[PDB]
Amino acid sequence: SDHKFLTQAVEEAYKGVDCGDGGPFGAVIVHNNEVVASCHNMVLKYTDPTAHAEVTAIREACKKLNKIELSECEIYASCEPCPMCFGAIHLSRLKRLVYGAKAEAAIAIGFDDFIADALRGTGVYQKSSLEIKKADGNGAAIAEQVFQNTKEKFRLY
Amino acid sequence: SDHKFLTQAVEEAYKGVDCGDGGPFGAVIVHNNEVVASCHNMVLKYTDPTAHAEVTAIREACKKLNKIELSECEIYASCEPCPMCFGAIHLSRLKRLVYGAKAEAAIAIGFDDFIADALRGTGVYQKSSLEIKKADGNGAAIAEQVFQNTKEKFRLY
């Protein structure tokens, strides 16, 4: 299950950067093997710096399920969520997070050095008990390659 | 001028609580001395856990100014911005944050212990260069009083 939805998030990243909606980031929210939302970064399309892939997916999934908590759902992110997105995941009560590429893969092509302490367990005040899985193997390699692959199709923001 | 805009953010908090839009939190974004956005928590109204007051104000200000960066604006928050909102403030490039009440005042009436390390200066992977001002005196008194005045006037989230 993890490989399928992670690859869906990666394909979302490619599609979003290809049509100019935003950067090469995707996110898929799933409810017991049923996809609730499949989104990508929409910062450029929406003129909204908060419209990262994870935030957009949370908004769509909550609107669909008519509830402000997604405690029965899991989220798959093509790239390690930023501090804003990890905070949104925390507030959404999503029960599990799977992400493909480390934030350094995005930093390597010029993105901001902007990493969530609560995700990496380096905070004094912010903690997380959320189940976090960093993908390994084939899906992880594919997810990491997204940034070297799409460096040319968009411009940093 | 700081007291006027902080008090407007507090007024937004009270308004949002009174009409059931969300919790007792407000945010106002100003360009010099002109209000660009005046918002409160819309989590309940929008069925959107990301629709905190600060995120809402950032979205509305970015729409008003037709751009994804607010480097010439400042933000006033009735309460210390959470990790998600502080991440959004970082991404929006707002040049100054003034906040009224410490997060402990909100936690003391039922909200989660959910504090941004980067705001308090304890972040390792997230570092802010933003100018941050915690309100004192009358502004702090007003902002802290928000939570005693609105206790059990709203649904917790």
Ligand SMILES: Nc1nc2c(ccn2[C@@H]2O[C@H](CO)[C@@H](O)[C@H]2O)c(=O)[nH]1
């Ligand atoms: N996962 C994820 N990351 C995203 C975005 C958008 C930008 N970024 C940047 O990526 C770097 C480290 O994550 C930071 O500079 C972030 O601002 C997204 O939509 N999803």
Ligand SMILES: Nc1nc2c(ccn2[C@@H]2O[C@H](CO)[C@@H](O)[C@H]2O)c(=O)[nH]1
């Ligand atoms: N500033 C601000 N805070 C908000 C909200 C909504 C909830 N909260 C909670 O308040 C506590 C302290 O920040 C945290 O648990 C947050 O989740 C908001 O709209 N604006």
Ligand SMILES: [Zn+2]
């Ligand atoms: Zn993000």
Ligand SMILES: [Zn+2]
């Ligand atoms: Zn917040």
